Write a protein that binds this ligand. Sequence first.
Ligand SMILES: [K+]
Ligand SMILES: [K+]
Ligand SMILES: [K+]
Ligand SMILES: [K+]
Ligand SMILES: [K+]
Ligand SMILES: [K+]
Ligand SMILES: [K+]
Ligand SMILES: [K+]
Ligand SMILES: [K+]
Ligand SMILES: [K+]
Ligand SMILES: [Mg+2]
Ligand SMILES: [Mg+2]
Ligand SMILES: [Mg+2]
Ligand SMILES: [Mg+2]
Ligand SMILES: [Mg+2]
Ligand SMILES: [Mg+2]
Ligand SMILES: [Mg+2]
Ligand SMILES: [Mg+2]
Ligand SMILES: [Mg+2]
Ligand SMILES: [Mg+2]
Ligand SMILES: [Mg+2]
Ligand SMILES: [Mg+2]
Ligand SMILES: [Mg+2]
Ligand SMILES: [Mg+2]
Ligand SMILES: [Mg+2]
Ligand SMILES: [Mg+2]
Ligand SMILES: [Mg+2]
Ligand SMILES: [Mg+2]
Ligand SMILES: [Mg+2]
Ligand SMILES: [Mg+2]
Ligand SMILES: [Mg+2]
Ligand SMILES: [Mg+2]
Ligand SMILES: [Mg+2]
Ligand SMILES: [Mg+2]
Ligand SMILES: [Mg+2]
Ligand SMILES: [Mg+2]
Ligand SMILES: [Mg+2]
Ligand SMILES: [Mg+2]
Ligand SMILES: [Mg+2]
Ligand SMILES: [Mg+2]
Ligand SMILES: [Mg+2]
Ligand SMILES: [Mg+2]
Ligand SMILES: [Mg+2]
Ligand SMILES: [Mg+2]
Ligand SMILES: [Mg+2]
Ligand SMILES: [Mg+2]
Ligand SMILES: [Mg+2]
Ligand SMILES: [Mg+2]
Ligand SMILES: [Mg+2]
Ligand SMILES: [Mg+2]
Ligand SMILES: [Mg+2]
Ligand SMILES: [Mg+2]
Ligand SMILES: [Mg+2]
Ligand SMILES: [Mg+2]
Ligand SMILES: [Mg+2]
Lengths: 218, 88, 160, 33, 128
Amino acid sequence: GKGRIFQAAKVYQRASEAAATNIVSGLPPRNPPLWLKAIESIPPAEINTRPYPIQHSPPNPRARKPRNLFRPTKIVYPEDELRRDFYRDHPWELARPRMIIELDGKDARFLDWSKGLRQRGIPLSGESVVQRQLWLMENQGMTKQEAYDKARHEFYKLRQLEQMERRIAVEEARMVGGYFGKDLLTVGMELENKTYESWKKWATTEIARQESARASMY
Amino acid sequence: PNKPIRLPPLKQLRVRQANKAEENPCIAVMSSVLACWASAGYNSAGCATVENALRACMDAPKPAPKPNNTINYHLSRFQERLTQGKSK
Amino acid sequence: GIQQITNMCSHLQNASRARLGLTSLPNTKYNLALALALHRAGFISSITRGGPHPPTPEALMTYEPEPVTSANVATRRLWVGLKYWNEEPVLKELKPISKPSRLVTASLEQLNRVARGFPAGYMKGLQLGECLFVNTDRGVLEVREAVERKVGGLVLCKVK
Amino acid sequence: ISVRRQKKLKIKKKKYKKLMRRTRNERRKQDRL
Amino acid sequence: KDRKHANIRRCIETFGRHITDQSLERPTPPLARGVEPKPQPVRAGPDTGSSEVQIAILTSKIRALSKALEGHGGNRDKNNKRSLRRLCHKRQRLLRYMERKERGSGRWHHMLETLGLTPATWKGQITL
RNA sequence: AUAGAUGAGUUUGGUGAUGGCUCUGAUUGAACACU
RNA sequence: GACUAAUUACGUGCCAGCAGUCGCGGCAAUACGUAAGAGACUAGUGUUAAUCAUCAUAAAUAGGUUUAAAGGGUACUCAGACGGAAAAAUUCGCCCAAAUAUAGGGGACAAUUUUUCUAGAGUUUUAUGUAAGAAGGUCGUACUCUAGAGUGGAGAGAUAAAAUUCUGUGAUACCUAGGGGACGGGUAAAGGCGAAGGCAAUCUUUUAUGUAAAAACUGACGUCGAAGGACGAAGGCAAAGGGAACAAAAAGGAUUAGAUACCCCAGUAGUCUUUGCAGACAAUUAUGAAUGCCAUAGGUUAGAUUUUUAAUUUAGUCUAUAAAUGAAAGUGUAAGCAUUUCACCUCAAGAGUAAGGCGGCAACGCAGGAACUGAAAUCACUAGACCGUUUCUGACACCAGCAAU
RNA sequence: CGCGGCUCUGAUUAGUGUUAAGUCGAAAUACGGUUCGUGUAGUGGAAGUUGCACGGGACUUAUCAAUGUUGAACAAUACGA
Ligand SMILES: [K+]
Ligand SMILES: [K+]
Ligand SMILES: [K+]
Ligand SMILES: [K+]
Ligand SMILES: [K+]
Ligand SMILES: [K+]
Ligand SMILES: [K+]
Ligand SMILES: [K+]
Ligand SMILES: [K+]
Ligand SMILES: [K+]
Ligand SMILES: [Mg+2]
Ligand SMILES: [Mg+2]
Ligand SMILES: [Mg+2]
Ligand SMILES: [Mg+2]
Ligand SMILES: [Mg+2]
Ligand SMILES: [Mg+2]
Ligand SMILES: [Mg+2]
Ligand SMILES: [Mg+2]
Ligand SMILES: [Mg+2]
Ligand SMILES: [Mg+2]
Ligand SMILES: [Mg+2]
Ligand SMILES: [Mg+2]
Ligand SMILES: [Mg+2]
Ligand SMILES: [Mg+2]
Ligand SMILES: [Mg+2]
Ligand SMILES: [Mg+2]
Ligand SMILES: [Mg+2]
Ligand SMILES: [Mg+2]
Ligand SMILES: [Mg+2]
Ligand SMILES: [Mg+2]
Ligand SMILES: [Mg+2]
Ligand SMILES: [Mg+2]
Ligand SMILES: [Mg+2]
Ligand SMILES: [Mg+2]
Ligand SMILES: [Mg+2]
Ligand SMILES: [Mg+2]
Ligand SMILES: [Mg+2]
Ligand SMILES: [Mg+2]
Ligand SMILES: [Mg+2]
Ligand SMILES: [Mg+2]
Ligand SMILES: [Mg+2]
Ligand SMILES: [Mg+2]
Ligand SMILES: [Mg+2]
Ligand SMILES: [Mg+2]
Ligand SMILES: [Mg+2]
Ligand SMILES: [Mg+2]
Ligand SMILES: [Mg+2]
Ligand SMILES: [Mg+2]
Ligand SMILES: [Mg+2]
Ligand SMILES: [Mg+2]
Ligand SMILES: [Mg+2]
Ligand SMILES: [Mg+2]
Ligand SMILES: [Mg+2]
Ligand SMILES: [Mg+2]
Ligand SMILES: [Mg+2]
């Protein structure tokens, strides 16, 4: 046994008895620890008792001798199927950065998918399409494909305007004397130069290495 | 083809020769000198350039040692995480 | 068959040793008898027969099992609720006495003596906390329940 | 049984095996094979 | 192998309890005291598990193997000598159980006379 | 019949086991030695 | 002396002696022999012999068998033990409950038996996969033999170094054309198959289990299993083949103080084929078979399901752990918790020996003591030391150089 | 009287136990200096030793030639060990 006998759940019991009587028989027991009375009415919780975990999906009714009865089950929602479908149809939608750092957790209080894709607190992304799709599919009794088409098409129109604003923004800005910094295209090419030059050096060295290594074959 | 196994619990995960072992360079240069003597001959003329190269190494100063490769330290950090665990 | 009780005793030990909340047992007229005895003595929490999967925990006592006909008798199973208190199981040991190789029987005069910490026959006295279950014509009673009823018979198991 | 104690039985079987061979003709004369 | 699975069909069609329930005169065993016959559900498929079918199939396997151990160089096959002693013993446990279960039913005598299963096949110890 | 269940010395460089030997208790239709 | 209540002095000097066990005695002995004291029982006190207990030390109550005594070489199986579900008849077993209890009551359980049930055990649906087995035939790399009035023309092979040895009757080396035997390269893996022993080139033929998924079918038909019988590695015996290679024996050459040996030149049984005998193995997982059950992780083998990408899942196998268990090492699909059954063990040594007996052609196998002699044998771990052990680290320890004996 | 059993004895001969101070080797325990044991068959004054298959109660004692990264510029009221 590489473990050790922990008794952290019985500190009160053991301590309470030790403070019951004095070690010098025939005297009043000295005052107990200051913490003995603090946690008097707060017994520890029960630990190490494997319960039947929550079943997030119907268990196999055919199994006659089921195993892993005390194993937590996987959490699957109806959205999982839809998210997989959409993001497979729009793989480059994953390059759009999405923040999963919750601010206060109260982001699902102002989400009303009956209005449209645009919502308060969340950006326009594939998730908004899925939630909107699920809403139409359930409330409006639409099919998976039908709801997918409608919500998906609204997603496109909102993205088109976003891309049009960028071009018209920079263009109009220069009509009144507006100058900007290095675009992402130019910056990207510059970094390749620094990296390509480093490759030239390495190539030249190894090339010369093989040449010198070829003189020994003869 | 199977994938690399999960190492069993070892006392210490490390590499014996952390830093490469440097081979004395002109020990090869000497081999060439010996080779030429075998084919050409001891008191020949084509051995001058080869013999002079052997004298060049001994005169030249030996290089300095390289900085130690800190690889055993990082292996000790991730030992319990990579393998089954530690044994003692 | 007595082999079922032995399997049941050994299983409840392993289930309590593994600190499990629920435990399954083959649905038989014999196992149920001893289970009710353990429950009537305060060792197990609840008893409910169901299928191969445990019933809804929140509604264990409200769980309404379906009729046990010949179409599903093979899948029925007894679900026992183990009990733990003070970081220690309440059904620690279930050593059996009457094995398939030999059925040990006790008389009323011997049970009276064993119920006060004095050996008698192939049994040993009962100490603090220990309990003995005897199978008689009045069901699977406790040694002290059989002494007040003035009966005896097959000794199933010693519960500590 | 360790190898050290198995060697004590090894020297018992060899001496006996070697004894039966040596005294095989003597036991053949007396019809004691 | 082709014959092996073709003979199994002959045994299921000859000794099948789903075919002998009408061909034989008294297939079922005689009723006991007080016991009255009752209707039972129909078989969803062909009877292939009854002791008659199993004993018949084992007989076909025993003949093929026993006939292969008596051929040229059959003695050299000393590993299948156990396979024959295992089929004869596996057939003995079904005959010994089917004897007291049927207790002289016409369905039990039709198998014996057809397959030639004499009393040595199950009464005592099969020693090979 | 409800008080009735006990150990000690000795293997090893040392420790824990296994396993015998011996002592601790009671006794004899007893013998012998000193009384 | 300690066990075991109770001390000094002198004498003796591994001598004389004491001793139930461990032990004491070799010149200042608490242990021997005297003296005094002390502890204790008491007309009894000690000793010897025996009995019970000590001893769970033959364990029914109540043991144990991986490493310590002790798992059978193997599992098909007669006898024999043991073994499902829901009811019923009988016994009145079991209980009240005795006094070896007339006559009754109670019905959970038990025995015989009857009727139903499908969870154990089986059958069918050509599974997949697979070095279980057997028959009849072949394949190939190398080896070897013969032939070429082959080319070539003095060495070759062996070993740490050599010798014996091969070669001018032409070797080694390089080829050509035939012949002959046994062997199984890669694939290849913690892989797989059989009851085990064991099974690895290939084609056809032939054979019993086993595994997965679905349905259907029989309806407890199950597990273990003394004995008998079957199978059983290498070696060995018998007969007839075969005979390239390897190789006990026999023999030669070296090494060595000596060399049976280890090494080397060669070499017969034997290894192989067919028919029998034989039955011993570290026949091992140092762990009998089978059933019920207990928390995880990482691989892996043959399938199945699926949103076949990757996850669930059945049956195996192997590492590392938890609870636990164990003397500990460790195990952890069990060496755990329980159960069934068979085999086996009861201090060491003598001894797996003797005698009688059975089996066998023989070798030998099965079975299986006692006398004499002991207080110890035995297992795991721990820390050291040692290693013609690994990796290091210091030292005129060594290399090198100078000088000296 | 014969047959069988049993007891004692027997030239001759075998095994084993005990016995510190003898002799001949150096087999095992470290890679014990030829890996050690199991079976079997030979061989040698003796311990030993050889052939054939088998066991690990011996090599899991295992520890990188994948040599280890410009993984998105710079500047600002942003940023500040
Ligand atoms: K001692
Ligand atoms: K054995
Ligand atoms: K020639
Ligand atoms: K047997
Ligand atoms: K020689
Ligand atoms: K697995
Ligand atoms: K003897
Ligand atoms: K010096
Ligand atoms: K040796
Ligand atoms: K020789
Ligand atoms: Mg042993
Ligand atoms: Mg053959
Ligand atoms: Mg020691
Ligand atoms: Mg004292
Ligand atoms: Mg005295
Ligand atoms: Mg004295
Ligand atoms: Mg008196
Ligand atoms: Mg075994
Ligand atoms: Mg045997
Ligand atoms: Mg029974
Ligand atoms: Mg009655
Ligand atoms: Mg009754
Ligand atoms: Mg049905
Ligand atoms: Mg089944
Ligand atoms: Mg196939
Ligand atoms: Mg099949
Ligand atoms: Mg010529
Ligand atoms: Mg050939
Ligand atoms: Mg094997
Ligand atoms: Mg191969
Ligand atoms: Mg298998
Ligand atoms: Mg039926
Ligand atoms: Mg069996
Ligand atoms: Mg053989
Ligand atoms: Mg042979
Ligand atoms: Mg011969
Ligand atoms: Mg040779
Ligand atoms: Mg035989
Ligand atoms: Mg073997
Ligand atoms: Mg057996
Ligand atoms: Mg395997
Ligand atoms: Mg393990
Ligand atoms: Mg145990
Ligand atoms: Mg002995
Ligand atoms: Mg004998
Ligand atoms: Mg024996
Ligand atoms: Mg050590
Ligand atoms: Mg010097
Ligand atoms: Mg001088
Ligand atoms: Mg004599
Ligand atoms: Mg030696
Ligand atoms: Mg050696
Ligand atoms: Mg050997
Ligand atoms: Mg070793
Ligand atoms: Mg080792």
